[PDB]
Amino acid sequence: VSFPASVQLHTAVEMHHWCIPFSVDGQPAPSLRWLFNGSVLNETSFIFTEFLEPAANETVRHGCLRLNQPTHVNNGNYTLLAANPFGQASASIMAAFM
C-alpha cells in the first residue's frame, strides 16, 4: 500500500535534553531534511534526529530533533521536509531555547 510522505512538527519541549518532536509517515519510506532559518541543517552531536523504536504494525515514525545543550545560536525557525515518490510535505515552527 503506497502512500504520500507526511510530516507533523510539535512545539519544542524540554525533557532534560531539548526536543522538537515530530512524526513522519509514507510508503515507500520518505527522505527527510531539516532546515534551520532556511539553511539546510547539518546534524552534529549537538543537534541530531533521534527516532523512537518503530511499532511492529505501523509505518509511522516518531522522534526528536534533539539538542543536548542548546545556546542562543540554536534559536530560530526549524523546518522538516519529507518526500517520497507519491508526495512531499513541509512543516515549520519557531523554537526559543534560551
Partner: peptide, 14 residues
C-alpha cells in the same frame, strides 16, 4: 543526513 544513522533508519534516509 543523520548523525546517528549513517545508513538510514529502517529505510528512512537523510
Amino acid at each position: 543526513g543523520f548523525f546517528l544513522y549513517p545508513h538510514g533508519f529502517y529505510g528512512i534516509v537523510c
